[PDB]
Each structure stands twice: as structure tokens, then as C-alpha cells.
Amino acid sequence: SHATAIVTNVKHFGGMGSALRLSEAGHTVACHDESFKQKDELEAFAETYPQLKPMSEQEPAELIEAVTSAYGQVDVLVSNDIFAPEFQPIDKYAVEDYRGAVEALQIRPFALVNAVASQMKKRKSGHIIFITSATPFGPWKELSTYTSARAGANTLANALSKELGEYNIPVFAIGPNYLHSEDSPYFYPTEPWKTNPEHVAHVKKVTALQRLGTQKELGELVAFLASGSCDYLTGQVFWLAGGFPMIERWPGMPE
Amino acid sequence: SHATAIVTNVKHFGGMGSALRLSEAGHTVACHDESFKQKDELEAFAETYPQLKPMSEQEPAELIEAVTSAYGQVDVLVSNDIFAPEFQPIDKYAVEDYRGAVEALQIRPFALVNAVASQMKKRKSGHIIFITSATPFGPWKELSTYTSARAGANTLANALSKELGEYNIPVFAIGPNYLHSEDSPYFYPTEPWKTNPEHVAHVKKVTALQRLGTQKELGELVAFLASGSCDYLTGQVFWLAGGFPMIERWPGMPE
Amino acid sequence: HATAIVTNVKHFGGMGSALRLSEAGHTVACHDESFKQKDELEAFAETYPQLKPMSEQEPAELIEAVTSAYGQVDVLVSNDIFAPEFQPIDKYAVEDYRGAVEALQIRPFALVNAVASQMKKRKSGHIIFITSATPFGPWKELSTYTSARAGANTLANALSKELGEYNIPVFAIGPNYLHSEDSPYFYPTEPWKTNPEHVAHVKKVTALQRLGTQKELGELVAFLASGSCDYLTGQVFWLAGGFPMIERWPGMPE
Amino acid sequence: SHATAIVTNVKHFGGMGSALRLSEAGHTVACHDESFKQKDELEAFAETYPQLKPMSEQEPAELIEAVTSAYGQVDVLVSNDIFAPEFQPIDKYAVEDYRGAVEALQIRPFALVNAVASQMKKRKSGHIIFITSATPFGPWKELSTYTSARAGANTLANALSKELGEYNIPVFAIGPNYLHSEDSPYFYPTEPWKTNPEHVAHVKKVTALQRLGTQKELGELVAFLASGSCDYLTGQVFWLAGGFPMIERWPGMPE
Numbered sequence A, B, D: 001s002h003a004t005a006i007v008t009n010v011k012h013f014g015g016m017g018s019a020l021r022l023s024e025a026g027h028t029v030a031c032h033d034e035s036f037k038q039k040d041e042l043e044a045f046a047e048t049y050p051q052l053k054p055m056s057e058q059e060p061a062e063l064i065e066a067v068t069s070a071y072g073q074v075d076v077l078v079s080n081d082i083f084a085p086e087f088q089p090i091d092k093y094a095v096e097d098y099r100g101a102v103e104a105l106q107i108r109p110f111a112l113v114n115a116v117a118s119q120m121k122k123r124k125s126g127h128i129i130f131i132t133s134a135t136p137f138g139p140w141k142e143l144s145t146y147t148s149a150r151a152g153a154n155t156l157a158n159a160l161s162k163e164l165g166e167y168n169i170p171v172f173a174i175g176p177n178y179l180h181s182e183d184s185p186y187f188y189p190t191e192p193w194k195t196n197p198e199h200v201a202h203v204k205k206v207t208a209l210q211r212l213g214t215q216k217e218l219g220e221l222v223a224f225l226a227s228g229s230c231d232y233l234t235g236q237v238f239w240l241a242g243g244f245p246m247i248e249r250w251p252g253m254p255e
Numbered sequence C: 001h002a003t004a005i006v007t008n009v010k011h012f013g014g015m016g017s018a019l020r021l022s023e024a025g026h027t028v029a030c031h032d033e034s035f036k037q038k039d040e041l042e043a044f045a046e047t048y049p050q051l052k053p054m055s056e057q058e059p060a061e062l063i064e065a066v067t068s069a070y071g072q073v074d075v076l077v078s079n080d081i082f083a084p085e086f087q088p089i090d091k092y093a094v095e096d097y098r099g100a101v102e103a104l105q106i107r108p109f110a111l112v113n114a115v116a117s118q119m120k121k122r123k124s125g126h127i128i129f130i131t132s133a134t135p136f137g138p139w140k141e142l143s144t145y146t147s148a149r150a151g152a153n154t155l156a157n158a159l160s161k162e163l164g165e166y167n168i169p170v171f172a173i174g175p176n177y178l179h180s181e182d183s184p185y186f187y188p189t190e191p192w193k194t195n196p197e198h199v200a201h202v203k204k205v206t207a208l209q210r211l212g213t214q215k216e217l218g219e220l221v222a223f224l225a226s227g228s229c230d231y232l233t234g235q236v237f238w239l240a241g242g243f244p245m246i247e248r249w250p251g252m253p254e
């Protein structure tokens, strides 16, 4: 009997670090991704990553039911939520641009917890992890849609911890920034963030560790939280951003 | 000339405290409310509060447009947002119950700012105030929809402050709890909160001031922020909750 | 006729607090290190005939002197200052942190410790600390000053929980980029309004792209001390103009 | 090659969980304690815990120097700081009661980092962990000294992360509450917190997981952070408090 995890949007953001490290820790890892609606994309992923179990199901209720049918139960949920950040002055958005952000970044993790929480509560075990964003900690101007939706997700995780603790289910939010996402455009691909001088310099300026975060670092945190080694952190919002933000110092002070 | 303010949902939550004090400060206060769809309700309100200017418009763009047409411009927006709090374990909600909360508590203030920001930015003046909630500061268990949507609104306000400051527009969020709402059910009506002993005792336990907050206190803060006397607070989330939460102390320690 | 105390009145948030509290009708007893000298006290008294400078320096003696002269202390504005010294952590002396915590934590604690009994007995009073917004977004190499200010913020918030039962609100106002006119604590006119590089820095790091004014600080102090919005008790106010502005990605405009 | 850790006040608070788990992870763990001034107490500890290395040094600079001399360097500092919480109304404290709290809970971790940072910066490696408190997250009334000093330490850790990241040195604060401390009075000994029904009931009410945190959970987090597996969390303040605080709900709602 292996523990079963679900990682959503596995090709993007914190998906690969989460899935790879959870598998290394002995989980069966069912993986969701928009591309897995296509048989060829699902099978290519299954061939490259024989330790992972890509699923074709897209919608929350269908995904939870399919993983429960295939593997018995869902022990760990990693809601690795993504949406394209679009920078606009507030008056240049359409209201639908905010609705799109809240559907992808708040309603979707809510729907996944809504669909899985009953089976976890009945057996009094489970772990729920949202991958959110550190942007609420220090917003950039002109990203009001994405940034506020991510904060809704952070508070959703914290609020859920208060009710699910009675059932021995920890709930966590991991909010990254400057997390290297390799080939994925969500949100710091190798090109340009490791390849272009202006981007390399920006990352050195705005993070304390002066580098991007790695998929391994994100995955190590995900597997540590899912292990049951430190459930007493339930309710935490983790800022996985390398010491971002670095705050501009007065004139004359060095870099 | 007169400064013009908009107070939404004026019959509820922080509506009357805001509208009455803004009018005392010399604003023309255009008032929105769902009941003003009915001519008899609008006219009854106008007769009781002849210093206030109730509008029939319901949707955010049409409300901004109607106030702008009637009075020239909108100087102060008070987005007094409401939604009925419904307590449920996460798995007992419908997903639509979260969508309803986000629409009412996040999308609506976004849409109002989206509709009014251009006119404020063009003249480089204006004030934006969201009435949100202090529940994200200390969530109750089983209120995950309402609580997380309110946090999204708080971050929306803070994020907007970063872009609108360049146009001399402060943005504030006032997050109440235990605010006496008189005859309004949103969220602490006189009955039961001043009349039933168990409720009086609860409020004495969980607030530092051991009382409900008053509409006058809320209105004083709204008019102070709208006055242009302290624009340098832009980006603040105010916790208007009387020292809530009081945290349960160890056995043997007194009330 | 309500009585206020404003400490370190020549510096930081002192003048804005004292001037606006007097405009609101308070008798404003003013403390300052320079008032140990009669000539400096009397010059201040002549320039500001609406203010009442005191010579007393230590917390117990100051509270006692104001209570004797004016009956009671209704409003305490602990306007605390210390010179920010930037060092790598290993280049400080431990005494440099001790000095910061004495000036920025122990001192407001001692003033509340000295005045709280009289406020509690009559169930009225207002306590305001002027602290700092540096904990909200620390600069590197200011660990002493920044962490002491955070201690003061939590002290205010913790005190609100016990003093609310006695109808005494407690607030912390944490500024940054507050114009301090001729005081070096912490943004004097020269260089912050006069040197182009400093003007440009303020435009970059605040959302309102300017220093905050003494009038804005004083308006908040008088508003809180008025009893018009006691239900904010426990608040830490970030009076920093939308600071911090967070550096955006390459190619995005200023 | 063996990494070297220092755990202070090892007999108390998070001392044993930290030291035991770091030793299991392969660190040489030098241990400080006030009782180690006595040769008999140091030797008794060495006999019971032969995998740990108790030191007699008491003062911060002399402790760093003694561990560096004995083992070559200090790779991990765990500043496990303690002070007896004394509840008083603000006017009943002596000012010295606050000075004692700041000296023990702020000056002491500062002094330890001040003494060790140069050797870490020179080799561009090291980890700094403060064990602080979650009391600033939700203060009890009448504990203003201890609570505010702990907040100063949390900010000290966060501020230090901004400068030490350039040297590849993460800085963390772990702020517990309701951490079972076994035989130590700091701060939740087995008697009364597992033996007396009133105390057992209090813990069930005020934490989401309805139990004390374990030394194992604390030690797992300390060893995880010190492993270099997730340096990108630098600057984090961890709330290790089981979902504390639970916020009192309205009359009529169940516990």
C-alpha cells in the first residue's frame, strides 16, 4: 500500500518539483495537466516519467473520482494553480480578466478541496497543499487581478486549516516567487531568466539569495509537508521566494 | 463647488455610518442599494434622509455613469460590499457558494474601481475605500468562502494603492468585525447582538473594548480618509474590530 | 481641557503631533532632550506659545510633572527616536542593539508603565506610539533599529488587549519617508527635498511619490486621540505613502 | 566530514527535539545549557545522551569560540531562547521585567549571530535558526513583555535574512505555541498539560489539531531547514502552533 498524491498542472509552475519529489518519497503520483486531454501528450509524458501516472481527467470532481477509482484514495492533494499574469492599469482590464483570475486561482483549489475533503475527513487523514504566490507579500504595481486572487487562495488555505485540523488534515499554502520553471512559461522559464543579462541582474537585485529558486527546493518542501513529519505547521503560508522582496536602499548605499 | 461620494448598499453594513458622516462633512453622497430598484423604496429613503441622494442604478458601470452625469464627477468611492455569511464544512458547500461570495466581495469592488479609475487618474485626485472584513485576521472555522473572498478584497485594495498613488489617489480597505449594523442583518443587528444575553457576553469576551463598534466610529474613519487629511496611509488595511480577536488564556486565568 | 504628552517634540513625528493636538484643543506638554537646558526650553516656549515644554527627562518624572502641573495625562504620544546605524550583523557591537532596544522598546514601555494606572482608574485615555514602517520591508544591514521597532509595534498591539477593558485604545503609527523638516530623524528637507538623487529615490519607493508631511502625521494623531474611532485599537498604521514599491521585471516602466 | 550544530538551552523548549534530530541527521551537536556550568550536570547529560556534546561555555562569544576550537567551525546555529513568561498588567511590571525579557529573547540571539556570522560569511555557507514564539500572532492579554520581545526576535531573523542571503546563509525563525516540552517548564510540560483534564481540554479548544505539538515535529523542521534542502524559505517566520489560534465562534455554534 503506497500513499497516493495528486499534482495538478504538472508541466508548469511547481508541478514537476512536487511530482518528482513525492514519487522519490514513495507516493503514487497521479498527475493532471491541460495537455493530457490529448492521448499522445499523455503517453509521451508517461514514457518520459515512468514513475508518474498522468491522468486525462480535467475537472475537479472527475479528477478526484478517477484517482480514487484507480488507486483507492487520495492521500495528498497538491493544487498547483496557474493563470497567465497580465499587467494592466486597473481601468484597462475587463472585469472578465479578474473573473478569469479568480476562477483559475481561487475557485479551482476550492473545488478540488470540496471534492476530496469528505474521504479525508472520514478516515481522519490527508494533506492539502496549495501552490499560490508570494506576490501578495509585495505586490508589483499593475497586477491587481492575479495578486489579489492569490491572496484569496492563501487565506482559503489558512481558513481551511481551522476546520480540517479536527480531522487530522493539515492544510498549507506555498507561495513562491522567482521559482525557476524550466521549460514552462509559468512563471520563470530558463529563457530569459537564466539566459538574458538584464533578467539575471534583476533576480540578483530582488532576492536575498540572488538566484532563482529550484524545482528541487519546492519539491523538498512539498514532500516534507506531505510526509506527516511536521503537521503542526498547519495553516502556514510559506513564502518560497529566496528572501524577496529586497527593498530599495537610500542613495549612496551599495548594491 | 461640492465633492461627490458614492456609498453602495447604503442600508447595510457600513453604509449609513459612511453616508451620514460624509454628508455632514459636505459631500454630496449618492447612495446605491438593491432596494432602490423599487421607486417606492428609493423615494421613502430620499424622504427620510433628504441630505442623501439615492440612485436607482444597480450595475457598477451604470452607477458610476449616473453619478458622473448628475453631479459632474465621482470624488470618493465607498464600496460597502456585502454577502450573507454561510457557515459550512468545506465539502458541504456547492462550488457556486464560493463563486457567489467572490462575485459579491471581490468582483464588485473591482468593477467599481475599473469603472471610476480613469476619471480620477485624469484629474489626479480621488479616494477609494473598500469596506471589507476583519475575518481574515482571525478566521472562524467553517466560513472559508466569505473569509477568503474578503482577504482577496483587502489585497486588491493594497495592490491598487501601488499603481494609483502615481495619480494622487489613495486606496484603503476598512475591515470591520462586530460593527453594530442596527436594523441591517449585515452583520450585527441590534437584535440579537444588543438584546440577547449570550450574544452580549460573546462580544464582551472576544473584543478588547468589550462592545460592538458603532456606525459613528466607522463613519468617522471613512470621512477622515476621504478628507484628504491623511493620504499617506494609502495601502492600509484597517482592522476596525475593537481589539478582536481576544485569545483564550490558560486554565485558571480570569476573564 | 484634555492634556497630551508628546516626547522628543523637536524630532520625527513630534512637531506634527504637538501642533495638531494643540489645534484640537489639548494642552500639549512637550518633552525633548534639549529641554534640560533652560535657554533651549524657553526659546521653544517663545516660538510655540501654544505648547508647554517640560524639562523632565525620565518617564516616571515626566508623567509625574505633567500630572502635577495639569491634573492628569489624557493622551500619551511616545515619539521614539534612535539614530539608525547600518552595519553588517558581525560589525555591530552588541551594545549597539542594546542601545536601540532601550530607546525604541524600553522607553515607550516605561512611559506606559508610568501612566497606565491613572488612565485605568478613570477608564479613559489614549496611547499612541510613533514607531516605524521598516519592519514591513527591512533594508539590508539595519537589523538593530528594524527589529526594535517591530518590538514596539507588537508592544502596542499586545497592550491594546489588556487596556481595552479600561476603555483605553492603544495604537502604533509606523512611518517611513516622513518629512522631518530640520530634524535629522529621519528625513530632513536637506537632502530629501533638495538633492536630485534623493528626490528620485523617494519618487521610486513610495506609491504617492513624495515624502509624507508633518500635517498628515499630526492629523492621524489628533484623530486617534479624539475618541472618534476607538474601535481601531490595536492597529499598527503604516504611514509610508504606499512604501514599499517593489522592483518590477526588466522592460517595465518606472 | 561532519557538519557541526549548536543548540542552546538544550534541556528546555525546543532544545531536545532540535539536538536529537540534528544528531540523527549526522551533525555533531554541541549543546549549551545554564546547568552545564556544573560539571556534574554536564557529565550526567553526556552520559544519558552520548551522541550529544554538552559544552560548559555560557556567554555567546565564548560558546561560538569553544565549538569552533573543538570541532573546526559552526555550520548551524539553533538559538533556542527562553525566558519565564510573567503575566502582569502593564503598570504592575517593573521596567526591569521588560529589560530581562529583551535581554533573553532578543539580545541573546543577536549576540550569537554577531559572534558566528563572520566565519559563515567567509565560507559562504551556514544556517541560522531562532526558536521564538507564536504569541505575537495572537497575544494573550497581560503578557506584553514576553510577547513583544519575541516579535522583536522574529523581525531580527527576517531582517538578517536580507543581508546574509548574499553570503548563501538562510535565516529562519520558528515560533511555536503549545509545544510539548516534556520535563521542561518552558513552556508546556507534561504535568499539567497532558495530565490535568482542564489543561487537556484547553489545548483541544485553542489548537486546530486539538493536541500539543511534539518535540519530534520541532526537530523535523529544524533538521529540514538545516539540511540545505530548502534554503529558498530564508526569512520565513514559521508558526509551529497546530492551527492556534482558534477564534471563538458566535453563540449557538458547536465547539
Ligand SMILES: [Cl-]
Binding pocket: A176, A177, A178, A179, A187, A188
Ligand atoms: Cl514563481
Ligand SMILES: [Cl-]
Binding pocket: B176, B177, B178, B179, B187, B188
Ligand atoms: Cl462587522
Ligand SMILES: [Cl-]
Binding pocket: C056, C057, C058, C061, C062
Ligand atoms: Cl527626569
Ligand SMILES: [Cl-]
Binding pocket: C175, C176, C177, C178, C186, C187
Ligand atoms: Cl520616517
Ligand SMILES: [Cl-]
Binding pocket: D176, D177, D178, D179, D187, D188
Ligand atoms: Cl511553546
Ligand code: NA
Binding pocket: A055, A056, A057
Ligand atoms: Na483517461
Ligand code: NA
Binding pocket: B055, B056, B057
Ligand atoms: Na433613476
Ligand code: NA
Binding pocket: C054, C055, C056
Ligand atoms: Na522644569
Ligand code: NA
Binding pocket: D055, D056, D057
Ligand atoms: Na568546558
